[PDB]
Design a protein around this ligand. Structure first.
Ligand SMILES: Nc1ncnc2c1ncn2[C@@H]1O[C@H](COP(=O)(O)OP(=O)(O)OP(=O)(O)O)[C@@H](O)[C@H]1O
Ligand SMILES: Nc1ncnc2c1ncn2[C@@H]1O[C@H](COP(=O)(O)OP(=O)(O)OP(=O)(O)O)[C@@H](O)[C@H]1O
Ligand SMILES: Nc1ncnc2c1ncn2[C@@H]1O[C@H](COP(=O)(O)OP(=O)(O)OP(=O)(O)O)[C@@H](O)[C@H]1O
Ligand SMILES: [K+]
Ligand SMILES: [K+]
Ligand SMILES: [K+]
Ligand SMILES: [Mg+2]
Ligand SMILES: [Mg+2]
Ligand SMILES: [Mg+2]
Lengths: 527, 527, 527
């Protein structure tokens, strides 16, 4: 409806490339062991100091809307890489800038940018196949410590404490990061669990920093049926809220009108309540529900056997937890106030059920329930002098945790950008169908050298010479930019998760190759 | 006396470097066989298209006076290289920019830039000594053709015609360049003379294109003594007024009172007249005077023997020339209208004088006089379609002539910037006296790679990789950027004059190392 | 000196292409039999209506200096085509625009525009050779009338009167164009003379419309020797001052003081005088001076035989002419007041001298002198109702005369742009040395279709379809754009001079391929 400005061809592509180049130039200074930090002014308080690429990317918006379009596209690259992998956002940003620049350079009258994008996608699929060929699984805790050390900008203490938390809890166990009042980082093992169901409505977020709902010493209400009716929730609301404590409502399916009343009580008067869907798709749902009620000290409502209704609720039928953390994709409970003897009885019942199962699939669920109820969770308190140092270290510790989980689930490859450098001969064996696919393959081939060049450039040396010497060396030799010398990467611990590398490459390639197909750009005229 | 703006330290150096970088970025696009051209708008008509570095440097002035200071200093580098060598101005410009940038980067509180300049000078002296050690004298006309071909941006026709002109006339003979009316270039051999005395007053310049006085079918007046009195020039100026041919007055020392009269008659009514000092010191001066008089048909006035006064001049005692060209440092006569028999008698007299002398010093003067009478003068007429193409081609022809004469004088070294690349181990063997001299030596060492990197960069390849592969290769192997491959440069003809390389390096180094000593910049406030 | 603005690469090239495109779009509307006219506002009086391409080109200057540079370069193309051939300036303009656009489109990082220019020159040489093979000489006066009709925008009356003037006077004879007081054009045969020597000083121009010096009923002074002394010109100038007829001074060589006095008298008080160099080299010069002194009724001064000095001049020793027209390169006398018996005696003497010559070179000079004395001068009086119509028609008549003389000199080819279309297979049989020469050859190959496409576009039809059907037809078939149908071009008389076509192509190609080598543009900042 509003008036629009329309730009065509080379001028529009140059303006979007200027926006892409500005955002990527800001992001790229943080890459590698010799990367620097970015200070972002916050509107409410102290400025934020970060080395995290997606944090820098999300904080940059440009007044020129043509440049802002390219900035938003590179921001999409960084955000998608952060959501899918939790690391490698700087790598994804510089790869996206490289693909966008080399694709913009190749636009001519006879060129077909859609087929160039098809060649880019084919080359990226070939590189991802080569990366999966080069990947090896993580077998030792030393590799875990090395991955967490590299991902935390070379901090050996973070790698050691993450390796210790993974040894004490498990490789698939849950580890969380929260603020510490001391100067040094500390690791504690406490009671709790995490399940992979997020919140149902986005109106319960009272902490806008992490988009999560955080309550302490809250009631948790369990039910086998869907907690729906007004005569089921309103007396429950009165009993739970009116006991000077918050409320957590775990149910099967919650969609309609009662949560709108919950949102009305949250926004107008300030009801501290949260509602989460229950996990499971069968009898495992009921088993985890009973385990929840035993661990929190609460009771199952609307069950088939006892038939306890939500119309008659008593305060002794509600579980008490020391903390509840609800995010978009998962929620978790800390320090339930349930009886220890009942938890031990349920654990022994789980042991007996494991002793009488051989289906090789219910054993997995029973072992998961036993690990959820037995070994506890890991909490990392990040020390530091001030809030800015603590937040920067939180960013690095979260990066290290995400990269360590990715390395556990999908293995490791050579770090320092050498893994992408070793996939160039896989591109050399490709036969393009036409000239535009050859252009796209060559774009990806010249893009694959960019992360190692950026890492070497941030170290103050010439990146092209370093990359050439890496390619002329054997397959195990790369460049330690911190020590500034050519070493065996595996024995020096400079390794990357395979998932992070392939996620960054795919997320950069899709958006940047889509961007290079543009001929016309339409913007609103500024008012 | 006007108001001034004063800037200190890093901001002033950054603005000066911005001006230096702007001028050097404009100049550097013309370097090498794949360099491009610069179009400069002319106020009086058609724009000029040039590949010549000093023309681009002279054509750029900046409104910001802090940037304009650095622009003027780099312009001084280019102009000094053009005056001293006639070639290599683009190389001097990029070397000066490199030295200025690395010197500005290395300035700290404890740094002493004067001692850094001392270390720069010591390193440049070492590199020039290595260049003299690496030089090879020119022995074959094929080397002459190769030098003239390389200096003329690679076309073999200019190199061949310059080689033919130097075969017909001689290695030390005089060759001139002027406009041609045909499409193709052509070489002619006509009879004439050249001596190394320029004009005495700058008011005789009629052609502002080359700051030279050009007359055709002109009178030549000769005298052994100084043409001094007013009554010595009143018959001469009366004959010039009464015979309609421009007057060339060659004398010993001309100053003060009647040169001012010639200026007055040139500016008010427009008398075509020029005054040149006589060449030689002693009997050689009067011998050359008699040679000029008998070659042009004129007579020597005020001589010791005949005692012919300047008060009584007859029209048959004045020489006639088909052309006279008077530049700042030399003068030339072409097509003297003298008797052939008298010239032949003078030539046989010179031969007989040589036959009875063995002094081995004035034998050189006698051979010079015989060459001036008998060897000939080459004229290159540059063909083309328009004035812009003709001027652009004459730039390269003049560059090739200057480089060929320099190669005759001082020999040849490897082209493509490889000669400077082979002087890096000479810097590696130096022991600096202190830290600042070490800084200057490292500045020169990193500067020595700049010309080859610029040549490779203009060829569309990565200059650092090319320079690394050259340095890892044998001493005879360099990079042909025209063919894009690594070749033996002597047998492929890619060679440079030694004088051009050392002149460009010295002229860049002195000015740029003086520039890097600055802390305070004082400019006038614009009105 | 003054502050400069420097632009790099694609933006500067786009700005100069905008200037080239604007000037060529203005010029191209006048092309062909259905071209339209351009009105140019004049500062002093009525606007000028023209179909002439170089007149439109020289009248356009742009405030944007970057666009004005390309405008000046295309103006140089048009001016060089007008000077060398006198026709085909619109064709040269559109060819130059085509070459500039296609060369600007083909510039990339790896492209070498200098070698592209070399390929352009090689392709243009091949096309010019093919045009010379395709050319045929003019044999019949019907071909003369057809050429003059085509060049005068289809005006058969102009072609007929030019053919009649060439039948009465000769194909190599002299024909002049001036204003007429009637409505229709007239042809008058007078007795007069023309030689190929222009004025010595450019200060003698009185009519700024055509840069020519025109006097009526003028004195003519001749001298075998150079008119040298002030004592030689003072009797002549006192006669020309007293006896009051404009003074034509024919001399051997004039460069000095008396011409400065002539210029001073021209500028201050207004002495209507002209000075022209003497034609010929040797005894032919003396014969011509005696011939024309007798033909004008004057006398030869300073001769070897009679020895008549320039100090004693009488009014009966000077010739009288009805008109004198002195341009930059040639001069003419009309209606010399000589004795008929003396001219007849000299003509019979020339016949007697022809009867005793067999060297086949002095016979040519004697026949030329006989044709000068007895052939006659044709004068075309151009009719019209007003000055603007007369000026437009005189532009067309001058174009027709230039094209007719070019067709006499070098023959004819097919008109309508078909001659350039038939040279495409000559480019198809070319093997380029590298990729850049291939790019230049392709540029010239696509450019060769532009004139016929422009002619068809001005006719209101689709040019590409017409050019495709011409190329698919036989070699003698072209497109009559006036009749709008495909005909035999020779049979219908749609023919062009070969010299005009090759001159336009060469003049466009040299400047436009030089322009496509630009990377940096330096302009003056406007004040
Ligand atoms: N000592 C080292 N030598 C060489 N490369 C190293 C070294 N330490 C880390 N790297 C490399 O640096 C890269 C990680 O850099 P960084 O963490 O700053 O960026 P990112 O993972 O792309 O983004 P972000 O952490 O901002 O989400 C990896 O490729 C890793 O292999
Ligand atoms: N085919 C080639 N391969 C490699 N280097 C080459 C080749 N041809 C020329 N060169 C190098 O290019 C340089 C000359 O470039 P150019 O003439 O443009 O600049 P310049 O001599 O520094 O300055 P200017 O000519 O503007 O006064 C020399 O170093 C020469 O060795
Ligand atoms: N009837 C016709 N059919 C086709 N082509 C024609 C016809 N008459 C003329 N032409 C062509 O038109 C062109 C002449 O156009 P025009 O005279 O307007 O331009 P020009 O010669 O390039 O420039 P200018 O006359 O302005 O100096 C020639 O190529 C000629 O062959
Ligand atoms: K980073
Ligand atoms: K150059
Ligand atoms: K026209
Ligand atoms: Mg990281
Ligand atoms: Mg040069
Ligand atoms: Mg015409």
């Amino acid at each position: 409806g509003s008036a629009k400005d329309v730009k065509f061809g080379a001028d529009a592509r140059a303006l979007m490339l200027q926006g892409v180049d500005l955002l990527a130039d800001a992001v790229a200074v943080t890459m590698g062991p010799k990367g620097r930090t970015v200070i972002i002014e916050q509107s409410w308080g102290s400025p934020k100091v970060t080395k995290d690429g997606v944090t820098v990317a999300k904080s940059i918006d440009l007044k020129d809307k043509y440049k802002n379009i390219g900035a938003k596209l590179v921001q999409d690259v960084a955000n998608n890489t952060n959501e899918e992998a939790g690391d490698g956002t700087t790598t994804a940003t510089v790869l996206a800038r490289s693909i966008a620049k080399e694709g913009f350079e190749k636009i001519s009258k006879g060129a077909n940018p859609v087929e160039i994008r098809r060649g880019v996608m084919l080359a990226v699929d070939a590189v991802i196949a080569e990366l999966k060929k080069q990947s090896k699984p993580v077998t030792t805790p030393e590799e875990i410590a090395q991955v967490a050390t590299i991902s935390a900008n070379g901090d050996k203490e973070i790698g050691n404490i993450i390796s210790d938390a993974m040894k004490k809890v498990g490789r698939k166990g849950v580890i969380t990061v929260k603020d510490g009042k001391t100067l040094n980082d500390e690791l504690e093992i406490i009671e709790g669990m995490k399940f992979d169901r997020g919140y149902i409505s986005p109106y319960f977020i009272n902490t806008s920093k992490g988009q999560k709902c955080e309550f302490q010493d809250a009631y948790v209400l369990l039910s086998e049926k869907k907690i729906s009716s007004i005569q089921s929730i309103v007396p429950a609301l009165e009993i739970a809220n009116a006991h000077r404590k918050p409320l957590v409502i775990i149910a099967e399916d919650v969609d309609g009108e009662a949560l709108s009343t919950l949102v009305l009580n949250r926004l107008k008067v300030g009801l501290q309540v949260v509602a989460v869907k229950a996990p499971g798709f069968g009898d495992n749902r009921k088993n985890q529900l009973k385990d929840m009620a035993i661990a929190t000290g609460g009771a199952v409502f609307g069950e088939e056997g006892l038939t306890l209704n939500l119309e008659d609720v008593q305060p002794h039928d509600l579980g008490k937890v020391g903390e509840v953390i609800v995010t978009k994709d998962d929620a978790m409970l800390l320090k339930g106030k349930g009886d220890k003897a009942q938890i031990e009885k349920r654990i022994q019942e789980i042991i007996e059920q494991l002793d009488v199962t051989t289906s090789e699939y219910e054993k997995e669920k029973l072992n998961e329930r036993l690990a959820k109820l037995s070994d506890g969770v890991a909490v990392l308190k990040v020390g530091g002098t001030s809030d800015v140092e603590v937040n920067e270290k939180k960013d690095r510790v979260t990066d290290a945790l995400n990269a360590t989980r990715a390395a556990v689930e999908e293995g490791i490859v050579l770090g320092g950008g050498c893994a992408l450098l070793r996939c160039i001969p896989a591109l050399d064996s490709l036969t393009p169908a036409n000239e535009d696919q050859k252009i796209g393959i060559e774009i990806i081939k010249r893009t694959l050298k960019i992360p190692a060049m950026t890492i070497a450039k941030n170290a103050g040396v010439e990146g092209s010479l370093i990359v050439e010497k890496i390619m002329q060396s054997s397959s195990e030799v790369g460049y330690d930019a911190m020590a500034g010398d050519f070493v065996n990467m595996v024995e020096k611990g400079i390794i990357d998760p395979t998932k992070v590398v392939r996620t960054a490459l795919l997320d950069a390639a899709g958006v940047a190759s889509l961007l290079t197909t543009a001929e016309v750009v339409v913007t609103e005229i500024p008012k």
